[PDB]
Structure formats: C-alpha cells, structure tokens
Design an enzyme around this catalytic site. Structure first.
Site, mmCIF file in Angstrom:
data_model
loop_
_atom_site.group_PDB
_atom_site.id
_atom_site.type_symbol
_atom_site.label_atom_id
_atom_site.label_comp_id
_atom_site.label_asym_id
_atom_site.label_seq_id
_atom_site.Cartn_x
_atom_site.Cartn_y
_atom_site.Cartn_z
ATOM 1 N N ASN A 90 65.352 39.969 15.818
ATOM 2 C CA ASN A 90 65.162 38.910 14.809
ATOM 3 C C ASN A 90 64.335 37.756 15.243
ATOM 4 O OD1 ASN A 90 67.161 37.619 16.323
ATOM 5 N ND2 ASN A 90 68.433 37.025 14.507
ATOM 6 N N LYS A 129 68.047 58.513 24.116
ATOM 7 C CA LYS A 129 67.539 57.475 23.180
ATOM 8 C C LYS A 129 66.470 58.009 22.334
ATOM 9 C CE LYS A 129 66.440 53.311 21.757
ATOM 10 N NZ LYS A 129 67.230 53.006 20.507
ATOM 11 N N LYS A 160 67.175 45.814 27.152
ATOM 12 C CA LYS A 160 66.644 44.501 27.473
ATOM 13 C C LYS A 160 67.724 43.428 27.835
ATOM 14 C CE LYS A 160 67.668 42.148 23.529
ATOM 15 N NZ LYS A 160 68.363 40.793 23.519
ATOM 16 N N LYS A 187 75.260 44.434 25.108
ATOM 17 C CA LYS A 187 75.227 42.959 25.226
ATOM 18 C C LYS A 187 76.540 42.484 25.834
ATOM 19 C CE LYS A 187 72.612 42.614 20.931
ATOM 20 N NZ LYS A 187 71.312 42.652 21.625
HETATM 21 N N1 LIG Z 1 81.704 44.834 17.692
HETATM 22 C C1 LIG Z 1 80.516 44.395 17.164
HETATM 23 N N2 LIG Z 1 80.431 43.047 16.980
HETATM 24 C C2 LIG Z 1 79.223 42.563 16.464
HETATM 25 N N3 LIG Z 1 78.146 43.241 16.100
HETATM 26 C C3 LIG Z 1 78.319 44.574 16.336
HETATM 27 C C4 LIG Z 1 79.455 45.180 16.815
HETATM 28 N N4 LIG Z 1 79.289 46.498 17.016
HETATM 29 C C5 LIG Z 1 78.095 46.735 16.522
HETATM 30 N N5 LIG Z 1 77.402 45.576 16.128
HETATM 31 C C6 LIG Z 1 76.012 45.493 15.691
HETATM 32 O O1 LIG Z 1 75.251 44.910 16.756
HETATM 33 C C7 LIG Z 1 74.047 44.501 16.017
HETATM 34 C C8 LIG Z 1 73.186 43.670 16.986
HETATM 35 O O2 LIG Z 1 72.556 44.467 18.023
HETATM 36 P P1 LIG Z 1 71.079 45.049 17.713
HETATM 37 O O3 LIG Z 1 70.951 45.497 16.355
HETATM 38 O O4 LIG Z 1 70.759 45.975 18.801
HETATM 39 O O5 LIG Z 1 70.136 43.731 17.822
HETATM 40 P P2 LIG Z 1 69.099 43.021 18.827
HETATM 41 O O6 LIG Z 1 67.767 43.465 18.343
HETATM 42 O O7 LIG Z 1 69.391 41.554 18.669
HETATM 43 O O8 LIG Z 1 69.433 43.621 20.205
HETATM 44 C C9 LIG Z 1 74.671 43.652 14.902
HETATM 45 O O9 LIG Z 1 73.687 43.493 13.844
HETATM 46 C C10 LIG Z 1 75.898 44.554 14.477
HETATM 47 O O10 LIG Z 1 75.541 45.256 13.253
HETATM 48 MG MG LIG Z 2 69.418 46.083 20.542
#
Ligand SMILES: Nc1ncnc2c1ncn2[C@@H]1O[C@H](COP(=O)(O)OP(=O)(O)O)[C@@H](O)[C@H]1O
Ligand SMILES: [Mg+2]
Ligand SMILES: Nc1ncnc2c1ncn2[C@@H]1O[C@H](COP(=O)(O)OP(=O)(O)O)[C@@H](O)[C@H]1O
Ligand SMILES: [Mg+2]
Lengths: 313, 313
Positions: A11, A130, A214, A276
């Site tokens: 984002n 992946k 990342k 994360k």
């Molecule tokens: N337990 C969780 N708590 C929060 N978000 C979660 C959870 N499990 C899955 N997600 C997903 O993680 C997504 C964010 O990671 P991701 O899409 O890879 O984004 P980025 O590009 O910021 O790495 C959120 O949009 C949500 O839909």
């Molecule tokens: Mg991601």
C-alpha cells in the site's frame, strides 16, 4: 533519537484495484513520503525497506511479452529484483528528499542496490512454494519447465504459474556500507523487495531465482544497523486473533512470549501476516526494544506507541 | 593512491552482435571486473560509471510489448533509467567484489541510484533529436505524439520513433554522499547511463524523459569526487585524427590546447567519439591531471600511461 527500520508494504506504492501506472505510484509514494517526513521531523534516525511483488510481477509480464514480440531475451528473477530496487528506490528517494526540502529540512536520501545472502542448502530450495509470473496454460507452463528447469503448479484455478523457493534471509552483502551511511545521518533505502537472493560458492556471490520475505529480510537489516525499533506498515492496523471471524480481536500491546503462543496457534496466515509476526518476534528475541505492526496511515501514532500492535520483551 | 573515475561503455556489457542475454552479460561483466580488480590491486581509488543505451532500449521494447499484450502500464524514461542502474549496478558490483574476494582483497562495492541535474532552460529541450524506443508506423507514432506530447521523426527508413532531448549534465543530486563513500574506501558505481535526468523547479527535483551522455556525466562525477584521473574505456584504443582515411593518425600523448583545436576541426564524430573527447577536454580544463581514452582490454596499461590517448594540461 531512536533508530527505526520502517518496512513498507504494498500500500505504500499501490492501492486496491490499481494497475500501478506511473501516476498512481507517484501519488501513493508522495503520501508515503509525507508520513516518513513527519517521523524524520520528530528526530528519529530512519532506515527504509519495502516490498516489490507487484513490481517484479509487472517486469516478468513485460519481459515475457518483449521476448515474444521482439525476440529480445527475458532476464531472470534476480535481475528483475535489481531493476525493481532501482525503480522503487528512485521514486522514494526523490519524493522523500523533496518533502523534507518542502519542510525546510535538507537531508541526504539514497538507495543502495542490495544482495541478500541465503544458505544454498536451505530446505526451501527442495520445496518451492511461492507462485509468481504470468498465468500460462498447461502446455506452455510444462514446456517452460522442461526447457528452463522450472517448477509449475496450477494456481488457484487461474492457470499455471511458476513456483519458486522462499529461503530464509541470513544477511546482506552490503550491510557494512548501509550501516556506515546510517551512522552518518543519511536516510538509506535498502533490501528492496527483500533484496536480490544470492548464495556464496567458490568465491562467488551468485544470484538465484527466489523470493525473500521483505519483513524477515527487513528484520535482519534492523539487526545489522542496530535499530532500536522495527516497524512494519501494512493495510490493516496490526495483527488480529481469529481474523475475519466473529471472535476477531486486534492485538494492541503484547509481550513476545504471548505472541509466540498465538503464532503457534495459527492466527497469522502464512501468505501475509504470519511472516510479519515472525519478524516482530525475531527482532524482540535479538534484543530490540519494540516491534510494531500497524497501518501505513497511522505510522506516526503507531511509532509513538498509541495504536497498532506493539510487541514488547 | 590516485583517484580515478572509470567510464565503461557498451563493450563492458555486450559485444558486437549480442542481444544482451543474462549469460552474455554475465560473461562480459566478469571480463570487465578482471580489469578493474587489477587496477584496485595496484592501489588506485576507483569510482565506476557506465552506459545504458541498449539496456534502457530493451526495457522500452519490453514495456511497449507488455502494455500491448497484457494491458499493464509502461513506465516513463526516467523510471526505465532507474531500472537500468539497478540491473547493471547489481551485475558489476557482484562480479567486481567476487574478483576482489578471490584475490584476497576485501573491498566494499556498491551501486547508488543517481539523479543527474540538467538545466530546464537547456536548448536541448527545444530540439530533441535522439531516437529511442520501438519503430512504429506513422499513424501510431503520430497518435502517441498527440496523446502524450511526444516528438516523433522517421528514423533512417526503419519506421517512426520518438526523439528526446540530450541535455548537458550539470551535477548529481547524490554527489556529496558518493564522495563521502569514496573517501571511506568504498568502490562506488554511480551515474549509470548518465544518471536519471532531473530538473530542479521551485526546489523540487522532477524527472524528465531524456538521454544524458554517460562520458560527459562521468566527467562531472570526476569533478565531484575530486578525481585525479578520468579514464574512458571503449572498443578502440583512443581517438584518431582523420579517422578511417589515409591521413589517419591515432593520438597518443596530446595536450589539451591541441585537442581542443582537433575537436573544433570535427575529427570526433558526434554520436560516438565526440563526447568522449569533449569530456576529456573538460576534465583537463577543470584542473585534472590526466584524461585517458583507451580500449577496455588495455585498461591497466592505459592507466599507467603506456597505451591509448593520454590528454595532459
Ligand atoms: N491474523 C491476521 N491479522 C491481520 N491481518 C491478517 C491476519 N491474517 C491474515 N491477514 C492479512 O494480512 C494482510 C497484510 O499482509 P499482505 O497482504 O502481505 O500486505 P503487505 O503488502 O503490507 O505485506 C492483511 O490485509 C490481512 O488481510
Ligand atoms: Mg506481504
Ligand atoms: N575520430 C575517431 N577516433 C576513434 N574512434 C572514432 C572516431 N570517430 C568515431 N569513432 C568511433 O567511436 C566508436 C566508440 O564510440 P561508441 O561506439 O559510442 O562506444 P561506447 O559504447 O564505448 O561509448 C568507435 O568504435 C569508432 O568507430
Ligand atoms: Mg557511446
């Protein structure tokens, strides 16, 4: 001021539904740069990393089409990752140095092209999972496998796509220079996309075609620069238990022992929030003071400890 | 040790006839890195730049094919120049640090993404004449001229192409950080392809779509890092008067007063050797000790003064 590694996500460059035209990305990058500029005005020592999935995917789409239309060779994934680091890092270093000059602040802001070392015997190279690149039909995807040594799998019913390894990041080739720059007050953009994946063999660093997470690579950069705080900015404001369910509960201040228990329970999905939370856990286990998972739009309030998921020792 | 800016050219990356596959480029960059590692073994302080014409050209062909086949957005020329700096920088920094490491020299080698400032009132912006990108038919080229504001021309009988400005490089946004890394003994690759072209407007750095000559931009990088020596490496061993004729004479040691006179006589063709001799003249007029034009494969002998064109005060 405290030293913070800020690991940007999708984002920061693209919103939901956008194709990633140049104008879209320039608007999203300027919005990101105002948040980082606020954090720099408050006195923090900032080091920046970011993702590159949609950007490397567009380059692989482009080069498959170039090779088919003009007969010019497509380049491999390590080269696509280096191209992405120059692209994204040029747009972030120009927007952030311009937003700091608009604030009456002159700062040096540079991108360093970064190679991330992995172990050649990492088990991810035995089991590539992946999915990446274009969606091919079965015939083209299996011919590419035969001719190039790729692995393919039908992907969620949208067609066949290569699958590549996701090895664990060990460190960065340029870590010494990155830390030297940070210690002299430069704002460095590094490990873009997780960095170009490389192994060491027979004296030579050699690229490999893979994806490195990342946030995991960002945590290793945070150890390398001796950061105090590691912050992940994403499109939700933290990590939640029982995500998407009626028992959904957003984590606020959480100790690392509790977050490790929650992690083994499975709440943080593997293609997304799991790494994360793993990266926040590792930063606290290494000795960091605080790790953060929050929404980009609440970066500054998160960094001050007021919102988002705040992981402590 | 003397500080030298080395400006590589086409043949550091591609030889005659090659399309520029990863394997071709990896072999040509390894050959380039063996030359530069010998210079570094000899105690010189090296700074590297290079060209990117064929490599930005490939990216422009890839992205026009990608947008035509998959409907994904092509990116503008400043972004393609950034992508090229990441791609070529990653290859040269990997190969050069590998040859240094196998020879028992531990040296840091990094690429910094570089923006090259030009004057927004440069007369080149009034008269674009460098053709770039794909060959189109007249309808498609004049539709793009209407919609995008391009200037198009029919190029040598092969179809119609966009033409862009070739402005004179004034300096580099990152010059202070580049020089601080050189003074700490890091081998820096910068200003790749002449750098991303940018102007300054109301204090804001803005990209423009243009080509900046990599030897003239290389000489401004040598001024900025206070180099002693500026050495252009090409595919012929110097500059010749009356090139290709019976009166042909290859310049060995030459003084800058004589070389300016030869330049005014028109011996050095504008799209190839002319900017190389202009850049050597400018480095001596700025106060450098020696500027060199020589073949890549004879770089060590040329830096030692034994072969090639040696321009002196
Ligand atoms: N337990 C969780 N708590 C929060 N978000 C979660 C959870 N499990 C899955 N997600 C997903 O993680 C997504 C964010 O990671 P991701 O899409 O890879 O984004 P980025 O590009 O910021 O790495 C959120 O949009 C949500 O839909
Ligand atoms: Mg991601
Ligand atoms: N007076 C001249 N002396 C030597 N070479 C010349 C001269 N005029 C033109 N050339 C051409 O300049 C070429 C090198 O410039 P160029 O092809 O642009 O290479 P690079 O990629 O190294 O910049 C030579 O191959 C030669 O054909
Ligand atoms: Mg040339």
């Amino acid at each position: 001021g405290k030293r913070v590694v800020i690991a940007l996500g999708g984002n920061a460059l693209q919103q939901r539904g956008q194709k990633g035209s140049y104008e879209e990305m320039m608007d999203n990058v300027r919005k990101t740069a105002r948040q980082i500029a606020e954090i720099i005005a408050r006195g923090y020592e900032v080091v920046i990393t970011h993702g590159n999935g949609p950007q490397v995917g567009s380059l692989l789409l482009h080069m498959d089409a170039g090779q088919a239309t003009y007969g010019i060779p497509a380049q491999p994934m390590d080269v696509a990752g280096a191209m992405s680091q120059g692209w994204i890092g040029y747009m972030i270093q120009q927007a952030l140095k311009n937003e700091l000059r608009k604030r009456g602040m002159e700062k040096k802001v540079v991108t360093i092209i970064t190679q991330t070392i992995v172990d050649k015997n990492d088990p991810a190279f035995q089991n590539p999972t992946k999915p990446v690149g274009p969606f091919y039909d079965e015939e083209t995807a299996k011919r590419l496998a035969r001719e190039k040594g790729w692995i393919v799998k039908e992907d969620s019913g949208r067609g066949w796509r290569r699958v590549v390894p996701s090895p664990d990041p060990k460190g960065h080739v340029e870590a010494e220079t990155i830390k030297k720059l940070v210690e002299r007050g430069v704002i460095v953009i590094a490990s873009g996309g997780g960095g170009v994946p490389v192994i060491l063999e027979d004296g030579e660093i050699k690229g490999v075609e893979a994806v490195i997470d990342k946030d995991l690579a960002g945590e290793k950069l945070a150890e390398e620069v001796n950061a105090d705080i590691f912050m992940i900015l994403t499109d939700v404001n933290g990590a939640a238990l029982y995500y998407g369910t009626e028992k959904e509960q957003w984590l606020r201040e959480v100790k690392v022992e509790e977050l490790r228990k929650y992690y083994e329970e499975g709440h943080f999905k593997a293609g997304s929030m799991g790494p994360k939370v793993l990266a926040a856990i590792r930063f606290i286990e290494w000795g960091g003071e605080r790790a953060i998972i929050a929404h980009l739009e609440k970066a500054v309030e998160a960094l001050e400890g007021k919102t988002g998921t705040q992981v402590l020792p």
